[PDB]
Design a protein around this ligand. Structure first.
Ligand SMILES: *[C@@H]1O[C@H](CO)[C@@H](O[C@@H]2O[C@H](CO)[C@@H](O)[C@H](O)[C@H]2NC(C)=O)[C@H](O)[C@H]1NC(C)=O
Ligand SMILES: *[C@@H]1O[C@H](CO)[C@@H](O[C@@H]2O[C@H](CO)[C@@H](O)[C@H](O)[C@H]2NC(C)=O)[C@H](O)[C@H]1NC(C)=O
Ligand SMILES: *[C@@H]1O[C@H](CO)[C@@H](O[C@@H]2O[C@H](CO)[C@@H](O)[C@H](O)[C@H]2NC(C)=O)[C@H](O)[C@H]1NC(C)=O
Ligand SMILES: *[C@@H]1O[C@H](CO)[C@@H](O)[C@H](O)[C@H]1NC(C)=O
Ligand SMILES: *[C@@H]1O[C@H](CO)[C@@H](O)[C@H](O)[C@H]1NC(C)=O
Ligand SMILES: *[C@@H]1O[C@H](CO)[C@@H](O)[C@H](O)[C@H]1NC(C)=O
Ligand SMILES: *[C@@H]1O[C@H](CO)[C@@H](O)[C@H](O)[C@H]1NC(C)=O
Ligand SMILES: *[C@@H]1O[C@H](CO)[C@@H](O)[C@H](O)[C@H]1NC(C)=O
Ligand SMILES: *[C@@H]1O[C@H](CO)[C@@H](O)[C@H](O)[C@H]1NC(C)=O
Lengths: 98, 147, 67, 99, 98, 50, 49
């Protein structure tokens, strides 16, 4: 910093970025994607999962009849991702190279 | 030195504008000569069409976008059990104004009477959650009894 | 071959054909339309064709039809 | 207002028009060495000759840029095989297009 | 221009560009989108409106039963887009910047 | 005596900085307003507490 | 000379990272606010969210 170099702080601080990310997550989880086009509608999660399955070529009967099981895996997957980053440091490589 | 600096700057700026040219070409190929389902590509919302217009060293589009309006909320249920077996909507959402049940499409209010024409069964109503009790009208019995 | 002097009038250069991009010698201007081969500029471009000579003309925007 | 049984549905829609402007091409330019660096004098051209081959590189780069700009403005627009024309009479179900 | 700088005119003049844009608009308004694949076909504009609504999850009964009303909005839409460019000069920023 | 070089350098660096600000503004802020989750969490057995 | 070289390097890297910014914007607009059917774009396989 002494000689001639200066650094300017970013316009958006970290907490505002976290607020945007939280808002996006909340919209995705409790509105589907109606807020992506116009006003934010509201719809429970179960039939949102049902339509997302319907969007790849499987009928709704796959989801509800196995709904409970579909929960467990989705939890366990997250229960793995933490261990995928709690110790391994090579995953966050690109940002380091930046 | 000055001439080399100028040439380098021009090279970088032209290489930058090449990307905008490619993006405009892709938008012209997709938005105009067809309909593109990529969200927030051709207009902000559900896309309908586009019209191109020239401009000095540039192009100006006219995205025509479909956007919903004032809405009303109601009570839902993911399935209806009639004779022990389940009944799922073929394409739509179950909705009710508190007294009579209906099935409607997902982007415009249009109630319809429950009928086997737009419903298919899958198993009995003991595993699905949120199941409700109702009846399903049969369109073939009335002309069975018309004789 | 044909020679193009860019942006200068053929009144003081030393079958000419003055054009917008400049003025050129060694070619004759036909009235017809053909797909462009050697682009010159300002919608005017030349080619080699039938005896045989270099001819310059206005570009043709492909074929035309109605619906 | 979120709950495990509540669905909202719109009852009306509005058609909107949105615009976006994209650049396509720069202005094709060119610069000649001997007229610029030197004052149209042999006393400068002779000295610049000692420096080897730079101006060939510069002119090649500028010509490449110009050709790329021409290719860009050709590629963005000319995507149709032939030119069409609108019928003289206008009947588009009430839609107005004469702008 | 005096010292050493020269400018070359573009290969395609403004009239040719306008002709291409007019051709594209004429194809889109009547032929639909078949001319983007092969030969150009013909189809009334209302039918194309129905076939475009059919692609976003609404049936044809939405369009025809309100067809006249729909036209008004579209006209009004264009009736605004002139004013949005009639006085405001900040919309055309990128071109001026270049 | 060397003329106008530092104007070019400062202009380039300022352009880069403004471009970075525009990038980080464009990547994230695509929502018109900020939403908030309800205090109660009933997502059909799905867990989002991480 | 050194300062000009540094400025040129920074210019090139910024022009490179602009592409990553655009790609991230496209992925945010497509994968998140809807479902994208482009194979091997949002996840390896059939995409959900
Ligand atoms: C849907 O909205 C449109 C306008 O957004 C409504 O049309 C209006 O109807 C009233 C009463 O007839 C008129 O006074 C207005 O001039 C109309 N507006 C326009 C732009 O034409 C329409 O009635 C609404 N439909 C429903 C079912 O609510
Ligand atoms: C589209 O709208 C324009 C604007 O109203 C119409 O142009 C007007 O036409 C009437 C009668 O033809 C004239 O009295 C007006 O002076 C015109 N307004 C102008 C020129 O600004 C046009 O006729 C409409 N086109 C269609 C097909 O309905
Ligand atoms: C999601 O899973 C976490 C991890 O098990 C749950 O957090 C645990 O909650 C129990 C009961 O409240 C506590 O006894 C544990 O100590 C918590 N674990 C940790 C690491 O804090 C969380 O409750 C789950 N979310 C739900 C059930 O909605
Ligand atoms: C419908 O939404 C409004 C707010 O938009 C809310 O006040 C009302 O309680 C909702 N109705 C039901 C039945 O949930
Ligand atoms: C619900 O809609 C049905 C449809 O005919 C109607 O008969 C009934 O009165 C409505 N109930 C209420 C509370 O609006
Ligand atoms: C929705 O949540 C309420 C809150 O206790 C509960 O009583 C009700 O059974 C739930 N509905 C379903 C279908 O799970
Ligand atoms: C639905 O009806 C069946 C038979 O009439 C009954 O066994 C069941 O408890 C009912 N469920 C509800 C939620 O009313
Ligand atoms: C070329 O010379 C003619 C001779 O009168 C003149 O009319 C014309 O304007 C000139 N064109 C240019 C571009 O100087
Ligand atoms: C056709 O070409 C001849 C030969 O130069 C020329 O004299 C004549 O004016 C041209 N006709 C038209 C309509 O351009």
């Amino acid at each position: 910093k002494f000689n001639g170099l200066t650094v300017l702080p970013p316009l958006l601080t970290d907490e505002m970025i976290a607020q945007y990310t939280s808002a996006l997550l909340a919209g995705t989880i409790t509105s589907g994607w109606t807020f992506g086009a116009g006003a934010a509608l509201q719809i429970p999660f179960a039939m949102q999962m049902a339509y997302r399955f319907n969007g790849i070529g499987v009928t709704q009967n796959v989801l509800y009849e196995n709904q409970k099981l579909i929960a467990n895996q989705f939890n366990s997957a997250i229960g793995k991702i933490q261990d995928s980053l709690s110790s391994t440091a090579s995953a966050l490589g690109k940002l380091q190279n930046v | 030195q000055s001439l080399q600096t100028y040439v380098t700057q021009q090279l970088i700026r032209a290489a930058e504008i090449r990307a905008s040219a490619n993006l405009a070409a892709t938008k012209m190929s997709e938005c105009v000569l067809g309909q593109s389902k990529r969200v927030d590509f051709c207009g902000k919302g559900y896309h309908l069409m586009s019209f191109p217009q020239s401009a000095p060293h540039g192009v100006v589009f006219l995205h025509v976008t479909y956007v919903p309006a004032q809405e009303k909320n109601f009570t839902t249920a993911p399935a209806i059990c009639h004779d022990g077996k389940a009944h799922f909507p073929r394409e739509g959402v179950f909705v009710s104004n508190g007294t009579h049940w209906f099935v409607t499409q997902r982007n415009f209010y249009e109630p319809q009477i429950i009928t086997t024409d737009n419903t298919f069964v899958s198993g009995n109503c003991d595993v699905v959650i949120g199941i409700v009790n109702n009846t399903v009208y049969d369109p073939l019995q009335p002309e069975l009894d018309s004789f | 071959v044909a020679v193009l002097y860019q942006g200068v009038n053929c009144t003081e250069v030393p079958n000419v054909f003055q054009t917008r991009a400049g003025c050129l010698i060694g070619a004759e201007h036909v009235n017809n339309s053909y797909e462009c081969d050697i682009p010159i500029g300002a919608g005017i471009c030349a080619s080699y064709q039938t005896s045989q000579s270099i001819i310059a003309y206005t570009m043709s925007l492909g074929a035309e039809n109605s619906v | 207002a979120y709950s495990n049984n509540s669905i909202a549905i719109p009852t009306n829609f509005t058609i909107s028009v949105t615009t976006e402007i994209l650049p396509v091409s720069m202005t094709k330019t060119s610069v000649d060495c001997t007229m610029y660096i030197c004052g149209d004098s042999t006393e400068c051209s002779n000295l610049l000759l000692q420096y080897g081959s730079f101006c060939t590189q510069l002119n090649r780069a500028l010509t490449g840029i110009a050709v790329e700009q021409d290719k860009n403005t050709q590629e963005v627009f000319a995507q149709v095989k032939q030119i069409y024309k609108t019928p003289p009479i206008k009947d588009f179900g009430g839609f107005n297009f004469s702008q």
